[PDB]
Amino acid sequence: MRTLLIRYILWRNDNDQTYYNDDFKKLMLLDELVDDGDVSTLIKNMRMTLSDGPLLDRLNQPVNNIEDAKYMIAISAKVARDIGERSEIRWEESFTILFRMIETYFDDLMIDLY
Amino acid sequence: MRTLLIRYILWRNDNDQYNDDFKKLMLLDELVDDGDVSTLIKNMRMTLSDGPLLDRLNQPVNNIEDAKYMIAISAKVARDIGERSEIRWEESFTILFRMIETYFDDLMIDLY
């Protein structure tokens, strides 16, 4: 699940068809869980501060259920999409936090998605 | 370069499936002796951890050739450890990129 998620988020950032996988379609359905106004706000702040800081702060918030985890995947995905490929983000730091929160739900997320 | 490298190492581990980019990166494999990888894999298995890999990656990088080796050692370990291996790859990337980040520009030039 770790690999698939790293791959999906990076793909959401550059949208390189060379690195596309069919398991991304199911993950993309989680986008409905995130309001675009929240993303707009988050992106604006990232740009305001010239950092991944605001993203990392959002990812550092508690995950108490699978729906919380699904949201975190989707917020990462939409931020990755909207921030642009030129964006010099140390993605591994975001993955560190994301997986620290969602890791436990991997098995159940695998079930819920496939 | 960060993205390409994350993609290459993960691909080396398990085959997602193809571009020219990975071909150039694969040429760096000659820099790493397979006996060193065999040893590293053996230790990882002995300890049931990425610990030995992380220890290798935490060693100093003083030139581009040092950086090229680190990419290749990561690649061959990724290959030889197997897909089933529950490795927190992001921790390896954290250390790898902490060492090699400065060389990204020159590595981009040297490879393409």
Numbering used by the authors:
A (entry chain C): 1 to 114
B (entry chain D): 1 to 17, 20 to 114
What do the study's own words say?
VACV protein N1 is an intracellular virulence factor that is expressed early during infection and modulates innate immunity by at least two strategies: preventing apoptosis and inhibiting NF-κB activation. N1 is a Bcl-2-like protein that contains a surface groove similar to those in cellular anti-apoptotic Bcl-2 proteins that bind the BH3 motif of pro-apoptotic Bcl-2 members. The VACV Bcl-2-like proteins N1, B14 and A52 all form dimers via a common surface comprising alpha helices 1 and 6 (the ‘1–6 face’). Biochemical and structural analysis of these mutants demonstrates that the anti-apoptotic activity of N1 relies on a hydrophobic groove on the surface of the protein and that the anti-NF-κB activity requires an intact dimer interface.
To determine if the point mutations introduced in N1 generated unanticipated structural changes, R58Y, Q61Y and R71Y N1 were expressed in bacteria, purified to homogeneity and their structures determined at 3.0–3.1 Å resolution. All three mutants crystallized in the same space group as wild-type N1 and the overall structures of all three closely resembled the wild-type protein (0.21–0.39 Å r.m.s. deviation over 108 Cα atoms). However, in the R71Y mutant, the tyrosine lay along the bottom of the groove, not protruding upwards like the original arginine side chain and so the groove remained “open”. In contrast, a R71Y mutation placed the tyrosine flat on the base of the groove. While WT N1 and the groove-filling mutants (R58Y, Q61Y, R71Y) were all dimeric, the I6E mutant was almost exclusively monomeric. Introduction of the groove-filling mutations R58Y and Q61Y abolished the ability of N1 to prevent apoptosis, while mutants R71Y and I6E inhibited STS-induced apoptosis as strongly as WT N1. Interestingly, groove mutant R71Y which retains the ability to prevent STS-mediated apoptosis, associated with Bad. Consistent with this, WT N1 and mutant I6E and R71Y all retain an open surface groove, bind Bid and Bad, and inhibit apoptosis.
